[PDB]
Symmetry: C5
Subunit: 204 residues, 5 copies
């Protein structure tokens, strides 16, 4: 509903209040997905990048940054973590995909593939989520934790109900994502809560 092309959400301070709710009419459990976005933060502590909870289910789909050079994906509370060489601080483009049939999770950082890991083969990610940027949920939509808050900037966020092949991940990294059907930065339905400011993306 809003085209955020060329813009970012700025989470300008540490808080337990500041967040964006992302709204998607996701009625069917997810068997496959890819999520891509850009982020720029100079936090050294742990923080959540993308928090997806469902009723009665915490950490149903969570992209979490434990520390520099380490990215984690949670699926139904279980997690995998893969490492990468990265500068700090530095803008980053992140893609992560997961496929129920194999359980394989693929992280791509700045268009470079990390080591594949695997979890929750056969599982379906539950539907009707609450999806939050800026805070890590411990409840269905809430129970945030200041020490897990994201401070910095996020943009170019897209989510597909399939596993993107390498050349489509590269297209997203280059700023030309293929059509996305779960979340789309160019037609995004969202709710700002607390202190979140929309600004031009100046670091790509």
């Amino acid at each position: 509903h809003t085209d955020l092309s060329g813009k970012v959400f700025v989470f300008p301070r540490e808080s337990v209040t500041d967040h964006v709710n992302l709204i998607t009419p996701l009625e069917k459990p997810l068997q496959n997905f890819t999520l891509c976005f850009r982020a720029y933060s100079d936090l050294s502590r742990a923080y959540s990048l993308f928090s997806y909870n469902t009723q009665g289910r915490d950490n149903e789909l969570l992209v979490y940054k434990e520390r520099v050079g380490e990215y984690s994906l949670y699926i139904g509370r279980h997690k995998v973590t893969s490492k990468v060489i990265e500068k700090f601080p530095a803008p980053v483009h992140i893609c992560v995909s997961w496929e129920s049939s194999s359980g394989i999770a693929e992280f791509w950082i700045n268009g470079t593939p990390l080591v594949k890991k695997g979890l929750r083969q056969g599982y379906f990610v539950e539907a009707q989520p609450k999806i939050v940027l800026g805070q890590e949920q411990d409840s269905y939509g809430g129970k945030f934790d200041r020490s897990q808050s994201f401070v910095g900037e996020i943009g170019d966020l897209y989510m597909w109900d399939s596993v993107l092949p390498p050349e489509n991940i590269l297209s997203a990294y280059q700023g030309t994502p293929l059509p996305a059907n779960i979340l789309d930065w160019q037609a995004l339905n969202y709710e700002i809560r607390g202190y979140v400011i929309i600004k031009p993306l100046v670091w790509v």
Copy 2:
């Protein structure tokens, strides 16, 4: 007023005495500003780069270097800090802007944007400042602190009453800044106190 094109102020030693007063007929409170300048220092300790105090108000607008790789902006005593990868020692070009309506502070270091932070949304920076280079003020024009003194060289200082877009920041970095209406290096009204020497800029 003096055209300091191609020249720098040299603060050649640590002291509590040496400083430059910058004079501007600033009568109305500031809602928006951008400040750019070049500096070269081999201090490892903390130091003030640009100190702006008003009657009864400390750190009304302060650009302060905590340590290598970390830049702070104070607005009305409140502070934000953002990090960057930089060599040490090394000449640097710094721009910082702040916008009351959003509270957003943007640092640019050698033409590269740091992570945005936010403070004092809705605040107006007071007018009738005393503006000092070389020392950090704790009073209106004084109460300096040797351990916060700037030792080294500063040049190409410009201050605008608006937030510069990236193209204008890069122009400043490259040595062709837009005309500036609060402070302008090519028409600077200043007072040297103590040991400050004007020399050609040899390090750009």
Copy 3:
């Protein structure tokens, strides 16, 4: 058998179970061999890359990574280790050859030769192995150890009953290996046990 051109085995989690059995029909003791393969793992702990045991004989031919930058070859329980400068994590191409007549072991890492070492001169590597990827054997086909399990991806595996000269090693590294007579990725007889997934090779 199976042509795995353009594919890898993914060992997506640490376990004492997940492995691939590799079957060679060439049944003879080995006086000379070369083994080449690609691997991508972000483990920092020790792990087995290629485990070849015979009846009643542990570590008959073993390629083992004790830590970053250090590759070990075991021949008949004796071991040599050579060091290399490598980024971590990073995909790697590994070739190792051994020649009974001299005892010389040559490791090549990304087409660069490591320092030669020597062991078991005059020895013959025993015939009729169980050859395992993903786990380190302590028995004939079993007695695995989760703390030595391989997590990550292996592809482009070839094994010859001769010592390859540098030009052939470079050919393998570049993706044009000479056909191999003990094990060949383009005609591989394998058995997956437990959680191992075949995926496209996306990192080379």
Copy 4:
């Protein structure tokens, strides 16, 4: 008196005895000077590069290296130090100038300007010096200290009674120095004492 083009003094060992006296008919106190030379040493401890003392005055003009990356100039016992990024060990080209009227000292290391510092504004460096390479003087011509001795090679030394502008500094660095009126490598009047060997310059 001697043309040392393409040659260095080699101080091949640590001692309290080995040195070179440089003779100049300098009768007028110095208001301005520049000194350039090349050096190559693998000492990590402190050492004197150029020691100029006058009767009753220690450290009248001294260029001293306290540790890697730090160069000091003394004028009349007072000192300033500036820092630089440098590899170790590595050959270096050093220029330093000082100007009484401003007190400004400029170090240039491999043609790169260090941060300016200032000392002894208004002072005149005393004439009738004893000038020593290889040792640091604490008396007029003597009282050396082996813990301050220079072990290594020095060449292409020039001293002018003016402050060289950047173009002339770069010319010296690139091997086209302006002829010099206090000390000049093409016509150097020197006395070797102890173990000092003249050899071709093979490193720069």
Copy 5:
């Protein structure tokens, strides 16, 4: 008597037994020499590269590597050491010359000159040596020490009875050495003892 062009000695293991004796027609004491060779080792501990002892005289001419980045030359039991920036592990080309008349020792590492040092000015290196690769002699031909043994590969060894100019050093480094009258890799008289294997040089 053997042309070892394109080949190396491989010392494939740590031992107190494995060594090569080099045989030269040298009855006259040495006043000048240059020694060049190429080596590739991943030892971190100290080791001997070239050990030349005479009757009743230990360390008469010894090239020894105490630790990464540091090369030592002994002449008649006296030693000098010079430092260099180098990668580890990495193939290296080493030349060292010594001149009795000046005492000057020149090390060149990968065609780069180290800081000159000086020792034993006026001394004559004794004749009738036993020359050993692979072990450090403490007696005339023996008393080896496993903790000083060279493990790895040595090739392209030449020794001249003169001090080579830089152009000739660079020629050796580049693979076109001048003919050498004390030891010549292309016409070498040697004795292998213990486990030493001749292999092609694959790392140049």
